[PDB]
Paper text:
The peroxisome proliferator-activated receptors (PPARs) are members of the II class of nuclear receptors (NRs) superfamily and play a crucial role in the regulation of metabolic homeostasis. They can induce or repress genes involved in adipogenesis, lipid and glucose metabolism, energy balance, and inflammation. Upon ligand activation (ligand-dependent transactivation), PPARs undergo conformational changes that provoke the displacement of co-repressors and recruitment of co-activators such as p300/CBP and p160, inducing transcription. Interestingly, the naphthalenic derivative 56 (hereinafter termed AL29-26) showed a very attractive PPAR pan-agonist activity profile: potent full agonist on PPARα and partial agonist on PPARγ and δ subtypes.
In the complex PPARα/AL29-26, the polar head of AL29-26 is engaged in a very efficient network of H-bonds with the side chains of Y464 (2.7 Å) on the H12 helix, crucial for regulation of the co-activator recruitment, Y314 (2.7 Å), H440 (2.8 Å) and with the OH of S280 (2.5 Å). The two methyl groups of the ligand form vdW contacts with M355, F318, H440 and C276, in the upper part of the binding pocket. The opening of this usually inaccessible region is allowed by the ligand-induced switching of the F273 from the generally adopted extended to the folded g* conformation (χ1 = −67°). As a consequence, the aromatic moiety of the ligand occupies the position usually occupied by the aromatic ring of F273, that acts as a gate-keeper for the accommodation of rigid and bulky substituents at the carbon atom linked to the carboxylate group. In PPARα the similar, but more spherical, new region of the LBD is totally filled, by the single aromatic ring of AL29-26, that occupies the first branch, whereas the naphthalene rings fill the second branch of the cavity. The accommodation of the ligand in this new region induces a significant conformational change of the loop 11–12 that forms the edges of the pocket with H3 and H11. Consequently, the ligand provokes a rearrangement of the loop 11–12 whose new conformation, closer to H3, is strongly stabilized by a vdW interaction between A454 and the two methyls of V270, on helix 3 (3.4 and 3.6 Å). A further stabilization is achieved through vdW interactions of the methyl groups of A454 and L456 with carbon atoms of the naphthalene ring system (3.4 and 3.6 Å, respectively). This novel and distinct interaction between H3 and the loop 11–12, indirectly, also contributes to further stabilize the active conformation of H12. Differently, the shifted position of the ligand in the PPARα new pocket, caused by the presence of the bulkier Y314 side chain with respect to PPARγ H323, allows to avoid the clash with the side chain of S280 (the equivalent of S289 in PPARγ) enabling the occupation of the larger and more spherical-shaped hydrophobic cavity without being perturbed the H-bond network of the carboxylate.
Author numbering: 202 to 230, 238 to 259, 265 to 468
Write the structure that this text describes.
Amino acid sequence: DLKSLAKRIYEAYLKNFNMNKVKARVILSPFVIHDMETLCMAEKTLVAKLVNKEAEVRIFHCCQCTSVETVTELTEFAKAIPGFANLDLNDQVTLLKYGVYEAIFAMLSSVMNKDGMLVAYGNGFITREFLKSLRKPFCDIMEPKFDFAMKFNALELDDSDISLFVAAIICCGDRPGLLNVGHIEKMQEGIVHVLRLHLQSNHPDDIFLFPKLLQKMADLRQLVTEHAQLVQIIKKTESDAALHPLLQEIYRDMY
Ligand SMILES: CC(C)(Oc1ccc(-c2cccc3ccccc23)cc1)C(=O)O
């Protein structure tokens, strides 16, 4: 009855996310993008959307397209979280609007290692150093996410842990403008309880793992706010490009 909830959530997570941690770790060893040269020969096969323009824009257009694909997946995942579909539609929409990027950056850690991150469904690998060399302010976009991911990955969670974590992020009672705050809080309370007991069984060698994950929740909220602004600046200083319309509405005057 608590076991069951963890199982239903894990199964929803396996069904709805194309990329997960087991799949990514196996992969992380294919085609490396480490400079402008290797970037272009990536774009002869891997990235077929803006197919020219400034390399910084091509890169993060490709990146925002992946984020939008993750938002799509997160929406299906949430509909499978027991209780979520029973909320008023505007509460479901509100939870997703304010929750998806906290979940995105949490799950992004799974396709990152200290050297770089998987891209294009794991058939490309862009190095951390290469991103760091891009012209300002594009070189500052992914670095704080790598920083988060390195600390997160050190916790050595598996997908059964992460599925519960992501459900807890989405079912959050303090998003602005919720109608049934009481019930969403009870949903959250249940998931977080199951998460704690799950971590105690799956990781009995780390007593402080549950508090460490609650710290990561706090970290992600800060990470998302800071990302919103960096995104805003790039829209102001740069319009060779175009921010995805969905991301525009999500980021707008939230934080
Ligand atoms: C993590 C990621 C990929 O961060 C982005 C960073 C920059 C852009 C971006 C990409 C292309 C043009 C832009 C213009 C103004 C502001 C941002 C952009 C899109 C996403 C995202 O928000 O999904």
